Design a protein around this nucleic acid. Structure first.
Ligand SMILES: [K+]
Ligand SMILES: [Mg+2]
Ligand SMILES: [Mg+2]
Ligand SMILES: [Mg+2]
Ligand SMILES: [Mg+2]
Lengths: 50, 139, 201, 173, 94
RNA sequence: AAUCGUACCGCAAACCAACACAGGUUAGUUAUUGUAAAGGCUGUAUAAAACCAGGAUAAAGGAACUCGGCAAAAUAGGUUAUGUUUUCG
């Protein structure tokens, strides 16, 4: 069968799996945020907007 | 306040003329009123939403009053019952348009056929007069 | 307003099987005089159809249908042609035109034909005996004569009862259901007002 | 001249199936009668010239049978009325050659050849066509030859009503 | 267009247009617009639009080839055509 | 009675497939006896090579084809007196 369609977008799934509230809920996620602050990435999470 | 709006720009409705908001191409039921080129802020706002295709006999409809009497007492069945009632209301708007479009097509076809008959009659009458002249000229 | 053929023997009929024109010259002349003279033929005859081609055809069918309803037994096409012309005057010219009208009636079950019985297919094909036609007082939904219609209805009635109970036994609705579609809009309301005005006038 | 092919009738295929091929040629023939001059590609023009000549022949016939055939070709009532009344009288004496074709070079985009198709006797004609009936000198070998071979040669246009029809009407009235 | 532009240039300099000969012509590469087009199975190819410069030089009394083209008149349409006046009675004689 | 959604695409040239991709994509509704209302859409210029692909017709023979009736063709449908086998349906 044709492959290459492994991404099926879903807004609710994206926020629950990779959101800021999720990253701040565990020690390992908090360490991930610090690593991205140290490298100086402009956007920290897929969930961020102004 | 009236129940239904009566002053519509029918050139806009059929599609020959552009609306007051050209960016909207297919108005929703509640967007027809403000897309009308003849919109005026002095006219009172109707108490109900109807499209231009609705018949004047819809002013005596009271749909939510009947729905309350048929309301199931079980909330789980009530939610599904309400969902189908909203589906019924929305579909009724597009039954009117379909009847509107079919009804006008029949009237147009009748008028076009009538014009076709008249044109042929004039052409045949003109030729007959020409034919008569030929015989008269030859004596 | 029937028109005569150039031979002045019959009227031309409005259908694609008519190969004779209508004489329309202001003076009456024999065919032989002007046909071989070399003059343009359009000066003497009209080869085209009338502006009311479709309406005339519908009127002729009604005359044929009404006459059959007045008959009490099946008759031939020749009798139909003579009967209509005698009642109203010279309005039909050939039996082929009447046959074409009858075929339309047969298709929509406004009339029926009585066919003979033959021992072999080849005898039926080669037979030349004329056919007999009747008319239904009202449009039916089955083909054939009233005896055949009754037989067909009986078979249909049995099938309907068979299907309805089979559906009930297999947990289906005995009678199919649909939703009522609203077919009354602003256009229909204006048509009704127009109809009343015409009726009043 | 128009080339003859191996298919039924010897017509062009116009790069189309037979069903679409007939729908196209009927439409163009209707427009030729309406406007009397059209510019198109060489292949469509060659086919239209031969098809157009045969459509005029039906109009000259002026019979019920001819009208039935033409009623399946022409698309508009006004164009069909003109064919039997106006064009029929125009080409009474002309024996063939009612349409002419002149080439006009190549197009711009696809560089296809083009041509102009027109009727051969009217106001606005590109050229002046020869008379429908050729005059014959009174003291020429041509006159003697035609007498020996075809005593019924036509030298001048004939009236709409010949003397025999006129005489009959006079006697009747 | 280049030929016409060059001749206009020659006249401004004071040369006789009736003695001009095409003595030099060549092309030169311009700036290209690069692009890509997809292919089957995830491969890719090039999609380039090319451009070129043209240079023409005209000189007087330069060595020239002897080629010459025959010229004929086009189709005569209008009142200038008189094919309809032909007398066809002569061809019946001997 | 506040607050958020309301444009446009949505079997698709605008979403998932690097593409204007012959692929993938949920629910609700509509005309039509042998047909089919509304609505929607639209192809550089020709032709009388070999060869290739998808169709049509074919004298006499009728599996002689081939690893193999592969492919193609074929009255294909319904009701039967009687007989056979059954775990008796
Ligand atoms: K012909
Ligand atoms: Mg919208
Ligand atoms: Mg890919
Ligand atoms: Mg064979
Ligand atoms: Mg073998």
């Amino acid at each position: 069968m044709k492959r290459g369609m492994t991404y099926q977008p879903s807004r609710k799934k994206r926020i629950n799996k990779h959101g800021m509230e999720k990253r701040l809920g565990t020690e390992d996620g908090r360490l991930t945020i610090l690593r991205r602050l140290e490298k100086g990435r402009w956007r920290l999470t897929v969930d961020m907007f102004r | 306040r009236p129940i239904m709006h009566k002053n519509w720009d029918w050139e806009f409705v059929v599609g020959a003329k552009a609306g007051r908001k050209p960016a909207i191409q297919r108005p929703k039921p509640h967007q027809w009123y403000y897309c009308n080129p003849k919109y005026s802020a002095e006219d009172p706002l109707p108490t109900k939403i109807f499209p231009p295709h609705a018949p004047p006999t819809a002013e005596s409809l009271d749909d939510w009053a009947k729905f309350r009497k048929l309301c199931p007492k079980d909330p789980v069945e009530a939610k599904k019952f309400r969902k189908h009632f909203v589906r019924f209301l929305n579909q009724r708007n597009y039954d009117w348009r379909t009847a509107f479009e079919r009804g006008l097509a029949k009237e147009v076809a009748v008028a076009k056929a009538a014009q076709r008959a008249e044109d042929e009659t004039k052409r045949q009458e003109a030729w007959h007069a020409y034919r008569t002249a030929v015989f008269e000229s030859a004596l | 307003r029937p028109a005569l053929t150039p031979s002045f023997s019959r009227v031309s009929d409005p259908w694609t099987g008519e190969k004779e024109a209508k004489y329309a010259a202001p003076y009456r002349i024999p065919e032989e005089v002007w046909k071989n003279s070399g003059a343009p033929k359009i000066l003497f005859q009209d080869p085209w159809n009338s502006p009311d081609y479709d309406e005339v055809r519908k009127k002729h069918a009604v005359l044929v249908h009404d006459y059959l309803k007045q008959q009490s037994q099946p008759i031939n096409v020749q009798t139909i042609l003579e009967g209509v012309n005698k009642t109203h005057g010279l309005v039909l010219g050939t039996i082929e035109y009447v046959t074409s009208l009858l075929e339309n009636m047969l298709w929509h079950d406004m009339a029926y034909v009585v066919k003979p019985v033959f021992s072999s297919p080849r005898k039926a094909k080669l037979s030349k005996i004329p056919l007999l036609y009747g008319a239904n007082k009202y449009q039916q939904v089955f083909r054939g004569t009233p005896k055949e219609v009754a037989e067909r209805y009986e078979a249909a009635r049995a099938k309907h009862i068979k299907v309805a109970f089979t559906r009930l036994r297999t947990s289906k609705t005995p009678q199919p259901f649909r939703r009522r579609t609203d077919e009354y809009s602003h256009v229909q309301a204006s048509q009704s007002a127009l109809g009343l005005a015409a009726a009043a006038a | 001249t128009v080339k003859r092919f191996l298919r039924p009738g010897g017509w062009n295929r116009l790069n189309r199936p037979v069903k679409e091929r007939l729908a196209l040629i009927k439409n163009m023939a209707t427009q030729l009668v309406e406007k009397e001059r059209i510019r198109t590609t060489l292949s469509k023009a060659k086919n239209l010239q031969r098809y157009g000549d045969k459509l005029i022949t039906l109009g000259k016939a002026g019979t019920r049978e001819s009208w039935l055939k033409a009623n399946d070709i022409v698309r508009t009532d006004r164009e069909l009325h003109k064919l039997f009344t106006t064009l029929a009288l125009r080409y009474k004496d002309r024996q063939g050659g009612y349409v002419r074709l002149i080439r006009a070079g190549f197009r711009r985009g696809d560089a296809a050849p083009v041509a102009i198709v027109e009727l051969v006797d009217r106001e606005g004609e590109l050229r002046q066509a020869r008379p429908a009936v050729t005059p014959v000198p009174k003291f020429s070998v041509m006159r003697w030859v035609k007498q020996q071979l075809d005593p019924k040669f036509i030298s001048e246009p004939a009236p709409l009503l010949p003397p025999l029809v006129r005489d009959y009407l006079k006697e009747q009235n | 267009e280049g030929l016409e532009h060059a001749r206009k240039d020659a006249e401004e300099k004071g040369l006789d247009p009736k003695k001009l000969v095409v003595s030099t012509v060549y092309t030169a590469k311009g700036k290209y617009l690069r692009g890509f087009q997809p292919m089957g199975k995830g491969f890719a190819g090039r999609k380039t639009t090319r451009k070129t410069h043209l240079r023409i030089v005209l000189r007087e009394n330069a060595s020239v080839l002897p080629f010459a083209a025959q010229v004929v008149s086009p189709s005569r349409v209008g009142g200038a055509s008189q094919k309809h006046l032909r007398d066809i009675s002569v061809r019946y004689t001997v």
